[PDB]
Structure 1
Amino acid sequence: KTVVENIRKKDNGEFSHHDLAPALDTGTTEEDRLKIDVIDWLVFDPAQRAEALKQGNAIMRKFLASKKHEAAKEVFVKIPQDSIAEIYNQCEEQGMESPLPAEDDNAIREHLCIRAYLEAHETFNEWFKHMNSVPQKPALIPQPTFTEKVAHEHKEKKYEMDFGIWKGHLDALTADVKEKMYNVLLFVDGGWMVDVREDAKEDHERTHQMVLLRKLCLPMLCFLLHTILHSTGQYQECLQLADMVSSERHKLYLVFSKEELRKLLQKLRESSLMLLDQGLDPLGYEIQL
């Protein structure tokens, strides 16, 4: 724990708010690997899985805030997939309670928040790889011969198939990424990167990082989900994001900037204009007459 916590503490880096900036290509460096290749010290012995998950969450909180999603996924793979069940095995044998203690119930809940965010990122990564693969429509040759017209029919009648297959995969990926982004934006009771055990110990590095990650990640996922829905023509669901963001169950309006609530009202209006020029009301209902 001291090896891992000293390596967690080597960053004399306060969470500045200018570094919202579009840094590019910020991949896993040697100073990130010396924090991926530190979780092993709590994974060699099963009696440390709870601490491996608590400190693994702390290093994932740093990498996710640093936009190093792959370095956070490298730490998520340093945590073995049995560990949530092993943290219950270590409770029922020996004069403990029904869940493992209040630091660790909150830590399992936090690791489940981090997994749901990695699901909501990788399904977006594959949706985005696929969306950019779009079959190019066969260009019309000027004044073409009979042979070149048959050699345009036998291109367009392949584009009809390729684009039909490509959209048949796009609408499926658009359902999966939409499950994952709703699982994070509507995450259960307390919500994403919030605790439940008020009987837990204070870590103010953890609590600050979680309140920060709710403000980096949840607005960003709403801007991604609006863009997924809008670029696929799902324009009324793009508007239901307003009632989700204002919802008193999840209070997502407390984690946006005022300028980003204004950016969201600007993007909501993009879908509202596409519904209007489709022949629907500003909210996507029928223009009855």
Structure 2
Amino acid sequence: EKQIELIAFYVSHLPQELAISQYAVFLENITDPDQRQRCLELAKEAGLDVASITKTVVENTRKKDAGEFAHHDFAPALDSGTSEEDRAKIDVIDWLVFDPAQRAEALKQSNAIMRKFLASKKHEAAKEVFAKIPQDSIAEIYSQWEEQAMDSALPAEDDNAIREHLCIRAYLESHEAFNEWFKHINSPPQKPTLVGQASFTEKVAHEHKEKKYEMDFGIWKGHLDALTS
């Protein structure tokens, strides 16, 4: 019968296990930001843990997908495109990021799907997701951890996420430096290449090109030396 304003007020009467297991499938098919925020407000008013519901949704989707080549670089057989589960993995992030409260688990799942993409060869999607997500993720994580006033039960998940994010950022910076260097090699190497000089305007254009090449070479060497250091 649909009507999302009547499901949360009746799910709470069910046992917690079955209620969560069914709210998972209920929220798996939810679109539109207005309807999403309406369901969020309804769940918050009824007293349902929609955050853990979405976390269990993501966990069930990952368990059904059974990962992608585990966490090891496994090259596909012959010629093939992307995996069929990558679309769902990249689409489930919308409802996960729609609730900014569980930043720790959000970054944990982001690192998990990043390892899955690195194993299944998806550096482009990895770069797009990294550009979409901010860089102060671990910063906000430890800020929330120190603001929640609960340092007695401090595990190692924060440090693991810090190390994972640092390694991912380093690998992405290395890859971007490599492709920028290759594109600069494909382009003229900022050297005075003889292309035919026999007039005043020709020599003026050649001098201007040499000056621009020197400036571009200086900027390239500077930023590449910084990144490589």
Match of 2:216 among 166, 170, 176: 166
Supply the distance in 1 between the matched residues of 2:77 and 2:220 (Cα, whole angstroms): 30
Establish whether residue 157 from structure 1 lines up as the match of residue 207 from structure 2: yes
SS in structure 2 at match of 1:34:
helix
Establish whether residue 137 from structure 1 lines up as the match of residue 187 from structure 2: no
* The structure with more radius of gyration: 2
Establish whether residue 43 from structure 1 lines up as the match of residue 97 from structure 2: yes
1:201-258 superposed Cα distances (whole Å, 9 cap, x missing partner): xxxxxxxxxxxxxxxxxxxxxxxxxxxxxxxxxxxxxxxxxxxxxxxxxxxxxxxxxx
Supply the distance in 2 between the matched residues of 1:47 and 1:75 (Cα, whole angstroms): 19
TM-score, structure 2 as length reference = 0.57
* Structure 2 stretches lacking a partner, 5+ long: 1-54
Supply the distance in 2 between the matched residues of 1:82 and 1:151 (Cα, whole angstroms): 52
Q: Contact 2:69 / 2:116 at 8 angstroms: preserved in 1?
A: no
Across the aligned residues of Structure 1 and Structure 2, the Cα RMSD in angstroms comes to 3.6
What code does the residue aligned with 1:167 have?
Answer: F
Supply the distance in 2 between the matched residues of 1:99 and 1:80 (Cα, whole angstroms): 27
Q: Contact 1:50 / 1:104 at 8 angstroms: preserved in 2?
A: yes
What code does the residue aligned with 2:109 have?
Answer: Q
Supply the distance in 2 between the matched residues of 1:23 and 1:75 (Cα, whole angstroms): 25
Partner of residue 113, structure 2:
59
What code does the residue aligned with 1:170 have?
Answer: W
Supply the distance in 2 between the matched residues of 1:174 and 1:81 (Cα, whole angstroms): 21
TM-score, structure 1 as length reference = 0.47
1:35-59 superposed Cα distances (whole Å, 9 cap, x missing partner): 1222334333344211111111010
Note the C-alpha offset of 1:80.
4.4
Supply the distance in 2 between the matched residues of 1:20 and 1:4 (Cα, whole angstroms): 25
Supply the distance in 2 between the matched residues of 1:85 and 1:170 (Cα, whole angstroms): 30
SS in structure 2 at match of 1:96:
coil
Q: Contact 2:67 / 2:116 at 8 angstroms: preserved in 1?
A: no
Supply the distance in 2 between the matched residues of 1:174 and 1:23 (Cα, whole angstroms): 34
Question: In structure 2, do the counterparts of structure 1 residues 88 and 99 end up closer, same or farther at CA, with 3 Å as the change threshold?
Answer: farther
